[PDB]
Amino acid sequence: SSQIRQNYSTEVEAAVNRLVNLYLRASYTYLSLGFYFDRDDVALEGVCHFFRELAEEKREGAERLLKMQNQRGGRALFQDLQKPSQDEWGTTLDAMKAAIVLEKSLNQALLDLHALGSAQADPHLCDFLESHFLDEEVKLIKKMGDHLTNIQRLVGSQAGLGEYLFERLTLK
């Protein structure tokens, strides 16, 4: 039961629980990415650290969503967290591409919940999404895009040298 729930639809409550699963799944993905780049046969620390910090951001995102769910009187429901899509992530370029795909899917999920909030006339939700999630995703996606462009420029015909340099001088 709740004695506080007001203007908080069951449709929004469910979408929020699905978004928590997506953020947690994203955190798991980034955990796998991070550790992949710490393999002795991959050994790009800067990449490890970039992805591990993203794991932590996505976990924090889920936690903020859960706290908001309780603030509105909604009920957290957790599902299975699906294993990441790959067991090995190839090059930094391959990984950065996979990260951007992931983030775009999270952003589209937030866009979808915002739409549903407008359709439900729930301005607290739409406010919460904007401040804490939408702006963050846009900034993060721009940083990833910038990274991908710099990695692409560095491939050329010297791909090993380029992957080292990016790691040392960007991820730095």
Tell whether residue 136 is among the known ligand binding residues: no
CB of 136 to its own copies, least distance (A): 10
Residue 130 near Pd ion by CB under 5 A: yes
CB 96 within 8 A of CB 149: no
Between 70 and 85, whose beta carbon lies closer to Ir ion?
Answer: 70
Residues 94-113 that bind Pd ion (CB under 5 A): none
From the list Ir ion, its own copies, Pd ion, none, partner contacted by residue 64 (C-beta under 5 to 8 A by kind): none
CB 51 within 8 A of CB 28: no
**CA-based radius of gyration for the chain:** 18
Tell whether residue 63 is among the known ligand binding residues: yes
As a whole number of angstroms, the distance between CA 27 and CA 29 comes to: 5
Q: Which two tokens stand for residue 46?
A: 């800067």
Tell whether residue 11 is among the known ligand binding residues: no
The closest of 78, 73, 76, 68 to 9, measured between CA atoms, is 73
CB of 18 to its own copies, least distance (A): 13
> Which of 68, 126, 141, 148 is close enough to bind Pd ion by CB under 5 A?
126
Name the binding residues for Fe cation.
53, 56-57, 60, 63
